[PDB]
Design a protein around this motif. Structure first.
Motif, PDB file in Angstrom:
ATOM      1  N   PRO B 981       8.197   9.770 -84.426  1.00  0.00           N
ATOM      2  CA  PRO B 981       9.759   9.684 -84.137  1.00  0.00           C
ATOM      3  C   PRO B 981       9.867   9.015 -82.609  1.00  0.00           C
ATOM      4  CG  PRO B 981       8.447  11.843 -83.793  1.00  0.00           C
ATOM      5  CD  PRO B 981       7.565  10.992 -84.588  1.00  0.00           C
ATOM      6  N   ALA B 985      13.008   6.400 -83.598  1.00  0.00           N
ATOM      7  CA  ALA B 985      14.140   6.614 -83.017  1.00  0.00           C
ATOM      8  C   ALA B 985      14.681   4.974 -82.828  1.00  0.00           C
ATOM      9  CB  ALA B 985      13.919   7.321 -81.414  1.00  0.00           C
ATOM     10  N   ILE B 993      20.605  -0.708 -78.083  1.00  0.00           N
ATOM     11  CA  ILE B 993      19.474  -0.586 -77.370  1.00  0.00           C
ATOM     12  C   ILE B 993      18.440  -1.563 -77.395  1.00  0.00           C
ATOM     13  CG2 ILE B 993      17.322   1.255 -77.180  1.00  0.00           C
ATOM     14  CD1 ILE B 993      20.688   2.112 -78.700  1.00  0.00           C
ATOM     15  N   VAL B 996      17.967  -3.477 -74.303  1.00  0.00           N
ATOM     16  CA  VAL B 996      17.437  -2.857 -73.265  1.00  0.00           C
ATOM     17  C   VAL B 996      15.993  -2.466 -73.602  1.00  0.00           C
ATOM     18  CG1 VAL B 996      19.716  -2.035 -72.627  1.00  0.00           C
ATOM     19  CG2 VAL B 996      18.328  -0.528 -73.884  1.00  0.00           C
ATOM     20  N   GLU B 997      15.476  -2.671 -74.615  1.00  0.00           N
ATOM     21  CA  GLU B 997      13.980  -2.298 -74.685  1.00  0.00           C
ATOM     22  C   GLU B 997      13.085  -3.485 -74.130  1.00  0.00           C
ATOM     23  OE1 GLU B 997      12.713   0.665 -75.750  1.00  0.00           O
ATOM     24  OE2 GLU B 997      10.843   0.069 -75.715  1.00  0.00           O
ATOM     25  N   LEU B 999      10.618  -3.071 -71.746  1.00  0.00           N
ATOM     26  CA  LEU B 999       9.526  -2.684 -70.996  1.00  0.00           C
ATOM     27  C   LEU B 999       8.614  -3.548 -71.230  1.00  0.00           C
ATOM     28  CD1 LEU B 999      11.430  -0.209 -70.579  1.00  0.00           C
ATOM     29  CD2 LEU B 999       9.340   1.330 -70.618  1.00  0.00           C
ATOM     30  N   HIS B1143       5.101   5.259 -60.913  1.00  0.00           N
ATOM     31  CA  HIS B1143       6.171   5.898 -61.675  1.00  0.00           C
ATOM     32  C   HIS B1143       5.777   7.453 -61.944  1.00  0.00           C
ATOM     33  CE1 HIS B1143       7.857   2.117 -63.037  1.00  0.00           C
ATOM     34  NE2 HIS B1143       6.716   1.787 -63.221  1.00  0.00           N
ATOM     35  N   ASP B1147       8.121   8.839 -66.730  1.00  0.00           N
ATOM     36  CA  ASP B1147       8.034   7.418 -67.210  1.00  0.00           C
ATOM     37  C   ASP B1147       7.026   6.799 -68.056  1.00  0.00           C
ATOM     38  OD1 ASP B1147      10.382   6.808 -65.637  1.00  0.00           O
ATOM     39  OD2 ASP B1147       9.410   6.722 -63.708  1.00  0.00           O
ATOM     40  N   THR B1150       7.154   8.677 -71.583  1.00  0.00           N
ATOM     41  CA  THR B1150       8.005   7.785 -72.606  1.00  0.00           C
ATOM     42  C   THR B1150       7.505   6.561 -72.962  1.00  0.00           C
ATOM     43  OG1 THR B1150       9.909   9.010 -71.179  1.00  0.00           O
ATOM     44  CG2 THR B1150      10.348   6.879 -72.579  1.00  0.00           C
ATOM     45  N   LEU B1154       6.338   5.211 -76.630  1.00  0.00           N
ATOM     46  CA  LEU B1154       6.887   4.069 -77.249  1.00  0.00           C
ATOM     47  C   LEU B1154       5.894   3.427 -77.744  1.00  0.00           C
ATOM     48  CD1 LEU B1154      10.089   3.334 -74.813  1.00  0.00           C
ATOM     49  CD2 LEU B1154      10.156   3.228 -77.167  1.00  0.00           C
TER      50      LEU B1154
ATOM     51  N   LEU K   2      12.717   0.571 -64.607  1.00  0.00           N
ATOM     52  CA  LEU K   2      12.579   1.102 -65.903  1.00  0.00           C
ATOM     53  C   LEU K   2      13.353   2.554 -65.931  1.00  0.00           C
ATOM     54  CD1 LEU K   2       9.977  -0.584 -65.714  1.00  0.00           C
ATOM     55  CD2 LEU K   2       9.071   1.089 -67.139  1.00  0.00           C
ATOM     56  N   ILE K   5      16.236   2.366 -68.412  1.00  0.00           N
ATOM     57  CA  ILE K   5      15.944   1.970 -69.629  1.00  0.00           C
ATOM     58  C   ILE K   5      15.051   3.585 -70.137  1.00  0.00           C
ATOM     59  CG2 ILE K   5      13.860   0.985 -70.877  1.00  0.00           C
ATOM     60  CD1 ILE K   5      14.288  -1.388 -69.022  1.00  0.00           C
ATOM     61  N   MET K   6      14.521   4.089 -69.257  1.00  0.00           N
ATOM     62  CA  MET K   6      13.924   5.402 -69.673  1.00  0.00           C
ATOM     63  C   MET K   6      14.909   6.635 -70.108  1.00  0.00           C
ATOM     64  SD  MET K   6      13.807   8.385 -67.759  1.00  0.00           S
ATOM     65  CE  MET K   6      13.361   8.300 -66.000  1.00  0.00           C
ATOM     66  N   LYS K   8      18.033   5.602 -71.254  1.00  0.00           N
ATOM     67  CA  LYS K   8      18.598   5.278 -72.594  1.00  0.00           C
ATOM     68  C   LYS K   8      17.849   5.412 -73.599  1.00  0.00           C
ATOM     69  CE  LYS K   8      21.774   2.022 -70.862  1.00  0.00           C
ATOM     70  NZ  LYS K   8      22.158   0.426 -70.741  1.00  0.00           N
ATOM     71  N   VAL K   9      16.231   5.176 -73.421  1.00  0.00           N
ATOM     72  CA  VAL K   9      15.441   5.369 -74.761  1.00  0.00           C
ATOM     73  C   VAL K   9      15.194   6.901 -75.007  1.00  0.00           C
ATOM     74  CG1 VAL K   9      13.540   5.216 -73.386  1.00  0.00           C
ATOM     75  CG2 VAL K   9      13.180   4.808 -75.822  1.00  0.00           C
ATOM     76  N   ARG K  10      15.262   7.571 -74.105  1.00  0.00           N
ATOM     77  CA  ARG K  10      14.950   9.113 -74.278  1.00  0.00           C
ATOM     78  C   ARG K  10      16.321   9.654 -74.761  1.00  0.00           C
ATOM     79  NH1 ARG K  10      11.980  12.715 -69.645  1.00  0.00           N
ATOM     80  NH2 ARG K  10      13.751  11.704 -68.365  1.00  0.00           N
ATOM     81  N   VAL K  12      18.073   7.995 -77.076  1.00  0.00           N
ATOM     82  CA  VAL K  12      17.891   7.527 -78.411  1.00  0.00           C
ATOM     83  C   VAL K  12      16.877   8.384 -79.006  1.00  0.00           C
ATOM     84  CG1 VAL K  12      16.819   5.690 -79.784  1.00  0.00           C
ATOM     85  CG2 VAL K  12      18.509   5.366 -78.185  1.00  0.00           C
ATOM     86  N   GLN K  13      15.930   8.811 -78.492  1.00  0.00           N
ATOM     87  CA  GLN K  13      14.972   9.779 -78.989  1.00  0.00           C
ATOM     88  C   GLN K  13      15.514  11.310 -79.366  1.00  0.00           C
ATOM     89  OE1 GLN K  13      12.197   9.158 -79.936  1.00  0.00           O
ATOM     90  NE2 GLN K  13      11.573  11.201 -80.799  1.00  0.00           N
ATOM     91  N   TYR K  16      18.060  11.048 -82.136  1.00  0.00           N
ATOM     92  CA  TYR K  16      17.370  10.740 -83.515  1.00  0.00           C
ATOM     93  C   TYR K  16      16.592  12.333 -83.920  1.00  0.00           C
ATOM     94  CZ  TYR K  16      13.187   9.842 -86.602  1.00  0.00           C
ATOM     95  OH  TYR K  16      12.497   9.966 -87.638  1.00  0.00           O
TER      96      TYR K  16
END
Lengths: 21, 1290, 25, 350, 20, 50, 150, 50, 50, 13, 17
Positions: B981, B985, B993, B996-997, B999, B1143, B1147, B1150, B1154, K2, K5-6, K8-10, K12-13, K16
């Motif tokens: 998931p 997602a 997004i 903004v991906e 990383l 971090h 962080d 996540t 990913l 990050l 970014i963290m 926004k992606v969380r 999105v998660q 979803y």
């Protein structure tokens, strides 16, 4: 009767520099 | 006297023999020669291309031998005739061989092993089938051409002044029959044009092996300075015994060796047990008989309590079986040939095996014992032919009130239920329906894929077998109702069998299973395979838990054969232990449905009763049980394999009609003519009238199997569990019939092998005979068959898993192949491959092999591996460039490269191999090199290699080539189920997004994960790897022409990395006189270079130092099911270096999610990383494989005791830094022990002068901080170590 | 990056190193 | 009793060549037969088992809570045992299983003798691990004196202004008062006549119960006051049990500012109780034969040892190392396989 | 002084004589 | 000349990390040849009192 | 099931690095797939006051683990109800958590805090602290529910 | 000449535990020719008193 | 039955033993239930049915 | 560059 | 960085899920 101590790289560099000059 | 000059001269003369007139020079690191080939020239000529002089370039080159191309000389490889300079010895073995030749009229096509069939000048149709059989079953493979081995044998015979019999028969053959065949260097499996007999390559391989063993035994004999070997009080000659064996086994090699390998082992196991005084080595460990904490005191001699027992009938029959076995083999060998010789020495020695004492502390007996077990190494890989036979249900044993079959079934069912409960106790459970579509990748390593899949790549269609591609293409169809309700019992659906060779025995058959059968099996059987992997259980018969009883998986966990199997030595050293080993015959055959299958099915059925509330897309668990196992699915199945053919006349096929001539779907061999059915085959088959062979093609001869299969997902567990049931029945019956005589102290179950450590309370012959008769009666009534000739019952000798122990000492047997190999291999990485063979040679020499001959073999192999395999590149004026031009004037030329042998002893990173001349277990490294050259004692050893350094060209290595040039057209259709998931997602978004991906995760990013996983799956497939191998030649040319002769020895490292050169920052002193008392050790058969190490430093008596930070990372990564086969710690640290350590836990969670890491592993890894970043230094230690070989595992090194005893270091150092010190300390102390230097403690010294301290502080500060990269990752300097380094050495 | 040395240079000062060994002994 | 329960029992005549109630006196009338009887008892009745370590989180939460500091216990927590040290632990447990016939002594090998941390840790452990009371002893006098010296060295090696110490007149070891409340350390000096410093301090070690299978030896041994009659479950047996010596040791440790060690021992107490419950069960149920020492000879071993009298059997002395005590404190003996000769012994005896 | 196998062989013969 | 037990100072002199004094600095140093000659002079002076 | 903000435990449970303890050990763990079922059982027992009660498991391991037992004994007195109107716990579980809280309260104490023991010798029968806090009220008693939410 | 019984110095309890005497190194030693002659001298002096 | 009763896999309850060493001769629990009634006595059959 | 305290000057550009 | 970014992606998660 033995091999003796082992010198580091710094001692060898100092020896080379002293021989050079 | 140095080995470095003798080996150099040896290999120099071998090279000049192989290529006459060579310009080879010892003082240069490489040499280059040209070779001419005309094969491409002809095929160009048939397109009408015009060439200059054709055979002239042959004739002018072979005769005058002085034409040059761009100044580089061109030579031709030496002829077969002159390999031994034409000498003859008229050996009797040659006439023994030629008497064993057989014409084609005596053909038995179903033969397991080929006989010595003659080759006629003219052709016949049966000879085509003979050729087809010989091309497959007579391959040698290996890595070095046989002619190089023969030249080495001749030269080393000249050096040592001894004449092996193998070289004698070699010269006798070549003196008259010239070449045997032709072999190509670019691919050694291209053996072709058999000249005299179809079995010649076996002759050459066996003769070279025999010569190698003869050289090894003589040099090992000279090492110990003994005049002859000893049996009891009598002298014996090893080379005489070896020649005596060789002359007898030559009529029919494979069959004779296979039938004869057993009595030799039985004699070694039975030697010396009945002597009145017995010499034993003391050993002490824990109360349990499988304790691994042994330690050895000294030798002693004691009276034998068991002396009177050996008049028993059981031992007499055990001996008499082997006398019949030796005598029938001798009779068969004499009858096939035209000789009347026998085995006189062995039959003389066999007569009094019991009473002749064994002397472990005398080398003259230990060498003999080790040599007898290593004799059988001359017929490697034992390729054979197999026949398809059905189940033959009629001979199966029906359960009646006279047998124990129903009891065996009941007890094994109870054991499945109990083991399932135990697995549940250890938080191991069956897969959940949420995990149905993700756990299918977790099949066991013994599994196999049924259907191969087809992939389009960009353009080309290819086929593949590995689970990854097949699943990623068609995994959704596996569970569909269409594929579940079909049975493999007809013409339209069936499964095929495969085969894989084994080093000595006959070829082993394997079964391929469709995934729709394996997955339901996995669903239930996964937790038990997971659970039984653990080690260290209690094996007492009165203990409730059955987890520790099974030894499957409890092997090589420590990594050393001597260390993990110490219980054998401990039990053999104990006079109060009686050991019993039952050897079954055709075990896998006798697992019937009457005794094994039904009880297992019932165990699984009432096993899942508490889980009956679960459902899987409408199906329930007891339906999944039938899906995994059932009629037409596993039991009662049709199987395909080798065809069956019959012997007829030619014109009988002519009188046949067209109904019998119809050719079916199934393919037939080259030399056989088709025929419709087996019934008409029975009508037509004639025995005396051999003219032709016919093979059926309608499918009436497929195998019907209703017996346990080796390809299943729970084979080992089921086998060991069944053996547990069998042993329980055996104990019950022996307790009932003869109470109190025998008490079981430990039971051991692994595979079909069973072991018992028991106490015997009587010495009366009639009681012991009745006990043995009861054991055999019980195992016979149980349904299996136990051979009284192989079954072992001894006080003082212990054997398990091809490991032998006699009277507390290790008797090694060596079966490591050096010449041949199991399958054809292509060397993608030369350097790592040579590393692998030197690591294996460490094991070989540790198993009693000679060290100097090992050095010579590696000296040979380090020169010829890279040769002949570079192509389409030519060198002129010391410059490499693509093959000529479009002129096609010198198109027939290729370049061959010869490497200096001494490149075996230059470290990795300097384009070489990290072996040490003093002893093979020490690994060369730049710091080790400079230390060796600063030692005054090693100068004579180090003198030649001093001038060979900075001359080595780069090594061939296709592995580092990674590019995108393998685009595939087939797509990952099952991606919708594989993606977590976390990945699912980030693909439903309208690319907002997507932008903004950003990383620093590399190829593991949403929108590209599927493609990269597919790409990696293709790079797992070699038949897909072969496409990108074309372009690597240009990169190799770039590597060659970018090379510069300069040695850098950069004792620094990348600031994120730390290595063992760090210890070269400080000076090292040797002081203090340590204790000189020698230590005891069980393995008394070593080279002196290894014996001195094992005597100065005792055996390891504790666990090794705590695992590294990278080890903890790898252990954590070993929790993810879907990413364990795709993620290493290197992959994590590479992403981390760009991501940064500063971090929070969220962080990193996540980021890991990913990157297809599931959230629990993500959380665990993130928390552990945060703890390591906050608390400790966190730098990863890189080691050059040091202290990782077989021998170093058994030494008392790299342990806390070792550091506390041998080491004194300043307290300012950190844990990773002190580990980096400690590895260098182990290497240095091992080297000092090898040279015979006095035993002294070692200290790291820091002087009082300010300038050295200034440089040390500067170097440490720059090492702990990655300079400008602190800007990239924003690492906080507030970490404890770096902040503390402010005033460490001020 | 890091210290700089060479075996080529070290071969000439090997005898000086041996002299230092003897002196410390 | 299956041989007496067939249907032909009504007309069967029984013959017996031996009798079960064997007189234990005839065995011990053999002159100078103590060591033979001890060897026979060991070979006949001693069971076999394995050793279990406690949960390592106890030392993590009670002994190494402060990373920035290091002490003797912190040094020896991370160590690992060897084979010879495990053999020494086996010797210690064998000496424990026989209260008076087997005693222990320390090896004279230097190294460990010069190491301070091991000596201090052994000095702390041995006062709780062993018994030197007024009924029987497990130790020689030299070992007790060495342990007292080690504990004296440990208790005041690093003291500051917060810990006030007042010395005594004699100058002997442990003759001082420490702590704010002036705790007296004189109770921890060894005294074999009364056993103040060890497990026998103010407790009942032996009793006598009249009905026994063998009438010559009917003593009942109970280390640290455990009446282990029922079967042992290690997770529940020692929840709230304690004895005098452990409490006094904890009081001294908290009085002297050794808070972390006191917490470690307080957490480790139930495991220490369970090991001794198992040992008393093994002694009272498995090692009961005519080869066991009679009551009249058992009550005179300590007076003969303290008075220097050699008119009877000299107890066997074994040698162990210093670190073996610390390794024994962290291992418990759990029997997994009882001896094969238990049910056959009385017939052989007769 | 240069290395030889002679002293190593001497030591192993000594320890084998001790074993005898 | 023999040194004392190396773990004597590990529990009393450098036991508390993150604190540095004179003793912590001088602990772990190793003398040169001249300092060993000086120690020999110390002992020779000690052996003859006046 | 939702989790609280990690910054809370970051700032208040592991605020200092040099010192560790039971809560600092347990705050780094993560639940496996089996333990979410146990959490579901906890909540299902909570929704039905007296119709469903719970008891602790019997297997070894966690019972010999000190930190888990200590933190569970601390948490249970606030998470559960054993009052005078209805109860969620078997008396055995209440006694076990009382013993765990007793072990937590005095596993490591110094001269700064003093303890005075009572006469009974039962768990939690002592007075602690400078103010002489009475700890007897936290022993479970189903007739009044003194130790829990009732 | 008769040596004393070896069981006096050391006693065995189990297969892996034995007791050690105080003079093991002297008991394990063996005499040489001159030491044997000295022993004979000792006995000759003992057997003739004055 | 004696062995089952004295084996306690939960928190131990109070037990009081009697003068004799006979099995089931104790009082168990807070209520002090007498366990002597379950020992076999064939005259009246207290321990079993009837 | 030896002192850690000089690094934060580089961190602050 | 990050952080955004963290988040926004969380987010999105979460949506979803």
């Amino acid at each position: 009767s033995d091999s003796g101590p082992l010198l580091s790289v710094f001692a060898l560099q100092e020896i080379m520099q002293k021989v050079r000059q | 006297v140095a080995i470095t000059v003798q080996g150099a001269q040896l290999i120099k003369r071998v090279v000049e023999r192989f290529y006459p007139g060579i310009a080879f020079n010892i003082n240069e690191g490489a040499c280059y020669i040209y070779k001419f080939s005309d094969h491409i020239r002809r095929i160009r000529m048939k397109h009408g291309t015009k060439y200059r002089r054709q055979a002239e370039e042959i004739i002018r080159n072979i005769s005058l031998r002085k034409e040059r191309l761009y100044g580089i000389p061109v030579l031709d490889e030496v002829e077969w005739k002159y390999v031994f300079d034409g000498q003859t010895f008229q050996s009797y073995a040659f006439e023994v061989y030629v008497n064993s030749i057989l014409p084609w009229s005596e053909l038995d096509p179903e033969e397991e092993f080929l006989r010595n069939y003659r080759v006629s000048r003219e052709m016949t149709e049966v000879e085509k089938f003979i050729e087809f059989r010989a091309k497959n079953e007579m391959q040698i493979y290996g890595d070095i051409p046989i002619k190089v081995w023969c030249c080495f044998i001749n030269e080393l015979s000249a050096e040592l002044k001894h004449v092996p019999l193998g070289m004698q028969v070699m010269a006798d053959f070549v003196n008259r029959f010239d070449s045997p065949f032709h072999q190509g260097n670019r691919d050694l499996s291209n053996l072709e044009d058999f000249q005299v007999a179809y079995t010649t390559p076996l002759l050459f391989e066996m003769c070279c092996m025999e010569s190698i063993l003869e050289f090894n035994i003589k040099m090992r004999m000279r090492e110990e300075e003994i005049s002859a070997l000893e049996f009891g009080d009598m002298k014996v000659d090893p080379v005489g015994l070896l020649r005596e064996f060789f002359i007898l086994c030559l009529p029919h090699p494979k069959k004779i060796n296979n039938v004869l390998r057993a009595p030799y082992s039985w004699f070694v196991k039975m030697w010396g047990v009945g002597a009145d005084p017995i010499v034993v080595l003391q050993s002490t460990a824990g109360d349990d008989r499988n304790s691994k904490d042994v330690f050895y005191d000294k030798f002693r001699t004691e009276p034998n309590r068991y002396k009177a027992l050996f008049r028993s009938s059981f031992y007499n029959e055990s001996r008499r079986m082997n006398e019949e076995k030796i005598l029938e083999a001798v009779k068969y060998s004499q009858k096939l040939g035209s000789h009347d010789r026998r085995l006189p020495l062995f039959e003389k020695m066999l007569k009094t095996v019991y009473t002749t004492p064994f002397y472990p502390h005398k080398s003259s007996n230990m060498i003999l014992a080790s040599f007898l077990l290593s004799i059988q190494t001359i017929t490697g890989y034992g390729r054979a032919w197999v026949k398809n036979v059905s189940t033959e249900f009629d001979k199966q044993l029906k359960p009646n009130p006279s047998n124990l079959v129903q009891d065996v079934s009941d007890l094994t069912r109870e054991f499945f239920k109990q083991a399932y409960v135990e697995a549940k106790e250890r938080r191991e459970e069956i897969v959940k329906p949420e995990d149905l579509y993700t756990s299918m990748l977790r099949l066991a390593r013994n599994t196999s894929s049924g259907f191969s899949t087809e992939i389009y790549v960009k353009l080309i269609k290819i086929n593949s077998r590995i689970k990854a591609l097949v699943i990623f293409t068609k995994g959704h169809t596996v569970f569909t109702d269409e594929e579940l309700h079909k049975k493999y019992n007809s013409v339209e659906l069936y499964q095929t069998k495969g085969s894989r060779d084994v080093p000595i025995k006959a070829t082993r058959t394997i079964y391929s299973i469709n995934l729709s059968v394996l997955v339901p099996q996995l669903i239930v059987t996964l937790p038990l395979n997971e659970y039984f992997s653990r080690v260290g259980g209690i094996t007492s018969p009165d203990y409730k838990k059955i987890g520790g009883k099974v030894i499957v998986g409890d092997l090589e966990a420590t990594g050393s054969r001597v260390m993990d199997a110490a219980d054998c030595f401990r039990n053999s050293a104990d006079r109060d232990i009686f050991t019993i080993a039952i050897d079954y015959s055709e075990y896998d055959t006798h697992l019937t449905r009457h005794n094994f299958r039904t009880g297992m099915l019932q165990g699984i059925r009432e096993a899942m009763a508490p889980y009956r509330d679960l459902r899987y897309e409408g199906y329930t668990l007891e339906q999944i049980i039938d899906f995994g196992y059932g009629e037409g699915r596993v039991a009662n199945t049709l199987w395909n394999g080798k065809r069956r053919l019959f012997k007829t006349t030619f014109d009988a096929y002519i009188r046949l009609d067209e109904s019998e001539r119809d050719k079916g779907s199934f393919k037939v061999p080259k030399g056989v003519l088709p025929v419709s059915s087996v019934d008409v085959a029975n009508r037509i088959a004639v025995d005396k009238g051999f003219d032709t062979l016919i093979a059926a093609t309608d499918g009436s001869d497929l195998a019907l199997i209703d017996t346990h299969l080796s390809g299943e997902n729970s084979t080992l567990i089921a086998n060991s569990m069944h053996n547990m049931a069998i042993g329980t029945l055996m104990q019950r019956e022996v307790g009932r019939e003869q109470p109190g005589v025998l008490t079981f102290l430990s039971e051991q179950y692994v595979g079909d092998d069973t072991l018992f450590y028991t106490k015997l309370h009587t010495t009366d012959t009639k009681v012991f005979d009745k006990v043995a008769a009861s054991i055999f009666d019980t195992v016979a009534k149980c349904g299996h068959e136990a051979s009284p000739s192989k079954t072992m019952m001894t006080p003082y000798s212990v054997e398990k898993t091809q490991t032998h122990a006699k009277q507390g000492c290790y008797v090694p047997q060596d079966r490591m192949m050096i010449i041949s190999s199991e399958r054809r291999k292509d060397i993608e990485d030369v350097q790592g491959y040579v590393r692998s063979q030197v690591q294996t040679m460490i094991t070989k020499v540790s198993r009693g092999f000679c060290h100097d001959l090992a050095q010579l073999i590696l000296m040979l192999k380090t020169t010829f591996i890279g040769a002949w395999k570079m192509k389409r590149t030519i060198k002129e004026d010391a410059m490499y460039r693509d093959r000529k031009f479009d002129s096609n004037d010198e198109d027939g030329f290729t370049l061959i490269q010869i490497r200096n042998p001494l490149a075996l002893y230059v470290p990795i990173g300097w384009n070489g191999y990290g072996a040490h001349p003093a002893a093979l277990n020490i690994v060369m490294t730049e710091e080790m090199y400079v230390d060796s050259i600063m030692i005054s004692k090693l100068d004579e050893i180090m003198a030649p290699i001093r001038r060979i350094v900075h001359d080595i060209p780069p090594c061939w290595n296709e592995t580092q080539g990674d590019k995108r040039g393998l685009i595939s057209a087939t797509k990952m259709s099952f991606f919708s189920k594989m993606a977590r998931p976390a990945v699912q997602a980030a693909l439903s978004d309208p690319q907002i997004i997507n932008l903004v991906e950003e990383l620093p995760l590399g190829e593991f990013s949403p929108g590209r994960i599927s493609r990269t996983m597919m790409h990696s799956a293709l790079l797992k497939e070699s038949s897909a790897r072969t496409l990108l191998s074309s372009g690597y030649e240009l990169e190799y040319q770039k590597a060659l022409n970018s090379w510069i002769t300069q040695v850098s020895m950069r004792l620094g490292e990348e600031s994120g990395v730390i290595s063992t050169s760090y210890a070269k920052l400080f000076d090292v002193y040797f002081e203090g006189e340590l204790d000189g008392a020698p230590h005891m050790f069980p393995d008394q058969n070593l080279s002196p270079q290894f014996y001195i190490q094992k005597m100065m430093i005792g055996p390891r008596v504790s666990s090794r130092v705590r695992n590294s930070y990278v080890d903890r990372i790898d252990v954590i990564l070993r929790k993810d099911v879907v990413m364990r086969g795709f993620i290493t710690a290197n992959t994590i640290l590479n992403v981390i270096e760009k991501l940064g350590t500063n971090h929070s836990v969220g962080d990193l969670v996540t980021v890991f999610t990913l990157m297809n890491i599931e959230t629990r592993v993500a959380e665990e890894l993130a928390e552990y990383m945060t703890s390591e970043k906050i608390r400790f230094d966190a730098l990863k230690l890189l080691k050059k494989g040091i202290a990782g070989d077989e021998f170093t595992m058994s030494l008392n090194v790299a342990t806390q005791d070792f550091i506390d005893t041998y080491l004194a270091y300043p307290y300012q150092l950190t844990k990773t830094e002190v580990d980096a010190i400690s590895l260098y300390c182990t290497q240095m102390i091992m080297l000092r022990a090898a040279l015979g230097l006095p035993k002294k403690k070692m200290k790291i010294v820091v002087t009082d002068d300010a300038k050295k301290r200034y440089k040390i502080r500067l170097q440490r500060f720059r090492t702990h901080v990655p300079k400008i990269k602190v800007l990239k990752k924003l690492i906080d300097p507030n970490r404890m170590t770096v902040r503390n380094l402010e005033n460490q050495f001020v | 990056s890091g210290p700089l040395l060479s075996v080529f240079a070290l071969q000439e000062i090997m005898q000086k190193v041996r002299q230092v060994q003897a002196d410390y002994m | 009793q299956e041989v007496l329960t067939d249907f032909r029992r009504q007309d069967t005549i029984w013959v017996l060549a031996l009798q079960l109630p064997v007189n234990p006196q005839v065995v011990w009338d053999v002159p100078r037969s103590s060591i033979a009887n001890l060897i026979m008892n060991i070979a006949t009745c001693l069971p076999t088992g394995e050793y279990i370590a406690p949960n390592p989180r106890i030392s993590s939460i009670t002994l190494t809570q402060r990373i920035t500091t290091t002490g003797p216990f912190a040094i020896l927590t991370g160590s690992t045992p060897t084979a010879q040290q495990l053999n020494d632990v086996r010797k210690i447990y064998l000496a424990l299983m026989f209260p008076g016939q087997i005693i222990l002594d320390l090896k004279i090998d230097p190294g460990e003798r010069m190491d301070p941390a091991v000596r201090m840790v052994a000095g702390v452990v041995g006062h709780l691990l062993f018994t030197a009371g007024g009924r029987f002893t497990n130790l020689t006098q030299n070992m007790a004196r060495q342990l007292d010296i080690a504990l004296n060295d440990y208790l005041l090696y690093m003291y500051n202004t917060r810990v006030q110490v007042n010395y005594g007149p004699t100058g002997e070891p442990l003759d001082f008062q420490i702590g704010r409340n002036q705790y007296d350390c004189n109770v921890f000096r060894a005294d074999f006549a009364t056993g103040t410093g060890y497990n026998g301090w103010a407790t009942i070690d032996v009793e006598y119960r009249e009905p026994a299978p063998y009438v010559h030896a009917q003593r009942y041994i109970r280390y640290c006051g455990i009446d282990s009659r029922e079967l042992i479950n290690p997770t529940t047996y020692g929840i709230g049990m304690t004895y005098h010596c452990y409490n006094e040791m904890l009081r001294m440790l908290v009085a002297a500012g050794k808070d972390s060690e006191a917490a470690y021992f307080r957490s480790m107490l139930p495991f220490h109780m369970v090991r001794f419950a198992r040992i008393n069960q093994i002694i009272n149920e498995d090692l009961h034969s005519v080869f066991s020492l009679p009551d009249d000879m058992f009550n005179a071993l300590l007076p003969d040892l303290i008075a220097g009298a050699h008119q009877n059997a000299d107890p066997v002395v074994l040698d162990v190392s210093w670190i073996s005590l610390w390794f024994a404190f962290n291992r418990s003996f759990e029997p997994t396989h009882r001896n094969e000769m238990l049910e056959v012994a009385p017939l052989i005896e007769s």
